[PDB]
Design a protein around this nucleic acid. Structure first.
Ligand SMILES: Nc1ccn([C@H]2CC[C@@H](COP(=O)(O)OP(=O)(O)OP(=O)(O)O)O2)c(=O)n1
Ligand SMILES: [Mg+2]
Ligand code: NA
Length: 338
DNA sequence: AAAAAC
DNA sequence: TTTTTGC
DNA sequence: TTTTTG
DNA sequence: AAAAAC
DNA sequence: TTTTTGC
DNA sequence: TTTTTGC
């Protein structure tokens, strides 16, 4: 009955198995850092499936007929039932390598590789990293260290409501017909988020007006001294930012907060695919594509859906129509929290 | 790690 | 040349 | 056994 | 995209 | 996938 | 490196 695919599941933000999901989330993180990619996904899909249950697990008979729960996962579950916690997860949480990875990757511009690079140099604290004269920091790592306290506290719903107003005012100044949609975790009903994700598309605007808007907005914020960081990408068209949000703009110190803002600019003909692809979650995204490939012999990505059998690209003006192409029951954004 | 011959 | 960062 | 896992 | 040299 | 900066 | 399902 319950599917192994997050796209065939309704997952709201009401998790009755947080005890188990937290333990599986730690063990999947440990395997991601130890590069055991296979095992890492296995715990991520088991953690995901339990978030969809409309009740807490209180016995091993409750695990009956749930997919993705094999011999190992059932062991982690069983241990949490008897001793109230996972010995496995506890041993990981206390590991020197795991502790480093988490502290290091919390800095914006530091991933698994640099975290391991710094660990293989004997670094365990951020004070030691910053104190070092010999170390060479990238432009991103510099902003991550500069605005560390603000970026380590997640973005809340009123702060995201305010940032949405900044984007709206900026975008409409250079493209009045443009449509601005808040994507990511906030579209999915979340109250926290590491950043504020946006999707911008213009129906009337030209190609020239399209390949320049993100520059015109980021330069607009630059002039006002709001642009704390910017990294541009062209292909869709993406701009990763760190913005200065003044407390006065938030509808309820230093007077402002540094906030990560992800702005995607897509062509108006691909907005349904971009909206589905940037809403998330990451697990719903991969299970949608895994379903398309293995169950329907189709190819789904952020810009198009191709049917490999009918040898055609499928058109869609809404997310409703994409689920329909794939033979899936429509899952509203707030039921995509896999 | 758990499926799937994915 | 390959690697690293960001979804 | 090997393959896949967005 | 833009560095950094992992 | 194409800049720049160093080793 | 493990177990399951189904040719
Ligand atoms: N590996 C990833 C990461 C992200 N995304 C998509 C889905 C969500 C969207 C925005 O990504 P995030 O910034 O990571 O935001 P979020 O997942 O919604 O959560 P958070 O609140 O932490 O930003 O990009 C994805 O498909 N695959
Ligand atoms: Mg987000
Ligand atoms: Na990081």
């Amino acid at each position: 009955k319950i599917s192994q695919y997050a796209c065939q599941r309704r997952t709201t933000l009401n998790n009755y198995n947080q005890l188990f999901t937290d333990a599986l989330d730690i063990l999947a993180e440990n395997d991601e850092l130890r590069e055991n990619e296979g095992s890492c996904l296995a715990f991520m899909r088991a953690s995901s499936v339990l978030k969809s249950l409309p009740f807490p697990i209180t016995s091993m008979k409750d695990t009956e007929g749930i997919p993705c729960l094999g011999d190992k996962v059932k062991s982690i579950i069983e241990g949490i039932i008897e001793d109230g916690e996972s010995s496995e997860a506890k041993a990981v949480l206390n590991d020197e390598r795991y502790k480093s990875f988490k502290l290091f990757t919390s800095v914006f511009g530091v991933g698994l590789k640099t975290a391991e690079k710094w660990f293989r140099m004997g670094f365990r604290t951020l004070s030691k990293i910053q104190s070092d004269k010999s170390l060479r920091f990238t432009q991103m790592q510099k902003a991550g260290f500069l605005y560390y306290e603000d970026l380590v506290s997640c973005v809340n719903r009123p702060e995201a409501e305010a940032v949405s107003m900044l984007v709206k005012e900026a975008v409409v100044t250079f493209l009045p017909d443009a449509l601005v949609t808040m994507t990511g975790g906030f579209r999915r009903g979340k109250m926290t988020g590491h950043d504020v994700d946006f999707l911008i598309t213009s129906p009337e605007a030209t190609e020239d007006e399209e390949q320049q808007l993100l520059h015109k907005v980021t330069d607009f914020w630059k002039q006002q001294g709001l642009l704390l960081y910017h990294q541009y990408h062209r292909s869709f068209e993406r701009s990763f930012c760190i913005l200065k949000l003044d407390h006065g703009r938030v509808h309820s110190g230093k007077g402002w907060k540094a906030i990560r803002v992800d702005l995607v600019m897509c062509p108006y003909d691909r907005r349904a695919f971009a909206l589905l692809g940037w809403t998330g979650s990451r697990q719903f995204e991969r299970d949608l594509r895994r379903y398309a490939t293995h169950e329907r012999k189709m190819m789904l990505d952020n810009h198009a859906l191709y049917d490999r059998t009918k040898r055609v690209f499928l058109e869609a003006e809404s997310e409703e129509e994409i689920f329909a192409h794939l033979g899936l029951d429509y899952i509203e954004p707030w039921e995509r929290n896999a």
